[PDB]
Design a protein around this ligand. Sequence first.
Ligand SMILES: [Ca+2]
Ligand SMILES: [Ca+2]
Ligand SMILES: [Ca+2]
Ligand SMILES: [Ca+2]
Ligand SMILES: [Ca+2]
Ligand SMILES: [Zn+2]
Ligand SMILES: [Zn+2]
Lengths: 262, 262
Amino acid sequence: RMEIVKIPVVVHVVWNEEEENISDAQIQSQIDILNKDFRKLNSDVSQVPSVWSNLIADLGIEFFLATKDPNGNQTTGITRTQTSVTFFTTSDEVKFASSGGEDAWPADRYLNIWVCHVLKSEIGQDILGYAQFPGGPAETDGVVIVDAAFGTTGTALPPFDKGRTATHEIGHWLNLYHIWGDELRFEDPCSRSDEVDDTPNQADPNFGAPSYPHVSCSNGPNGDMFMNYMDYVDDKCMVMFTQGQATRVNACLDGPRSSFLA
Amino acid sequence: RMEIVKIPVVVHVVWNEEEENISDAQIQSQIDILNKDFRKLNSDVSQVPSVWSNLIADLGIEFFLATKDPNGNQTTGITRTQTSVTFFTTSDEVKFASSGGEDAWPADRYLNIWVCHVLKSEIGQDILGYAQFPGGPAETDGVVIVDAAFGTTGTALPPFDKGRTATHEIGHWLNLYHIWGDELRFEDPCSRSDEVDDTPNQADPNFGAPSYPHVSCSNGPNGDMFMNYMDYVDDKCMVMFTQGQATRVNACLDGPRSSFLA
Ligand SMILES: [Ca+2]
Ligand SMILES: [Ca+2]
Ligand SMILES: [Ca+2]
Ligand SMILES: [Ca+2]
Ligand SMILES: [Ca+2]
Ligand SMILES: [Zn+2]
Ligand SMILES: [Zn+2]
């Protein structure tokens, strides 16, 4: 029998122009997707090659917008903060009131999700989202997603309009690593591990919509598990976590995030 | 005539075992190095190939341990905080008391330098230090260096015992990018720029002690400027900033860090 872990979420919408102050419906659409993907209830799980059907996991996690604020008072579970800031970066400006964002709620009790319009990496690349892995400071714990990649209605835009950026970043929040192993430019692309046996060793990230099989690192004939949420493919293409990943998630819930357990 | 910008520094020593509570002498040795490297007074500047002699810059910045704390009271400019934490990461745990580190002093008035024993990247690689570029939140502004790579005496160890890790990270703090451009694994290694014309286009980081010339990206015959502080070579090998880098630094001081100006 699975113990379903129910995670309270607070969504911090940080907006400059009115259009970025995204609707309640758009936010709720994201929660709905999380409750499918983390329970193996997404219909598109049918896309997984049958050779790997046996490895598809139900992570046994569900999410809901918080009903009580950190001090025990009724809340919608959504904060909305106007800002004059035109873009945020991975340096966490969105996570502090002082830098034109919104302060985190207590990370031992809530999953903080910030949503903003523009997000850049430290070297100016536009990105869709970023996570903090377990064990970092509470002040910046959580995930950040751009509004055009959040939810399945409103400002969400293809190919990132199926809510999978949040599924991917929350995977990091639960201690999952990129399936290809995150090699640096000069390292052998077959050399690093995501620390999960049942995800095939893989060269580089996959983007777009690859055709099965996509072989790398001598992993034929089945190839890369590019339909795993921890690859970089388009939303419609990523549809599963593995049981080996569930093991890591379980270790995260039993350890550093055990405060979320009943 | 150069206007010398004088930057007050606070060093936050965060220590678990006694040996990590580094000496006043070791800390002062680091300040002494910064005051040579940022003024072109380091004797090893003679190591620069003569073809590039004309490009070597005096940044006109000097550093001193703060004499007044954030509320105007006398200070040594050094905080020392015992911790039970055994390693810190790029997630900034060392920058908050809550996560076993030490809170930043106001970033508009001080350069925060944290020193700890062990530092890892997000994927568990041992690293020597890391910076926050300008514009990020004040709470985490500054640089972090491991004690074995800090100063020129005490616990500092070759090949990182000439105080250059701090010179390099403070370069980032002043808006300088890696000279090779930070390509991702799958990108053309000649494709990204550090946004400085007088640093030659360069494939990858250099490590150790390269022999001149080291050509990449068709940048012959002179090759990579691997003796620049913003490469990744050993301390004894990095000895200069360029005038083009000085331009970026000046723009940083005139803009986002203008609060440090007299
Ligand atoms: Ca941070
Ligand atoms: Ca694997
Ligand atoms: Ca790989
Ligand atoms: Ca250049
Ligand atoms: Ca390059
Ligand atoms: Zn990711
Ligand atoms: Zn660097």
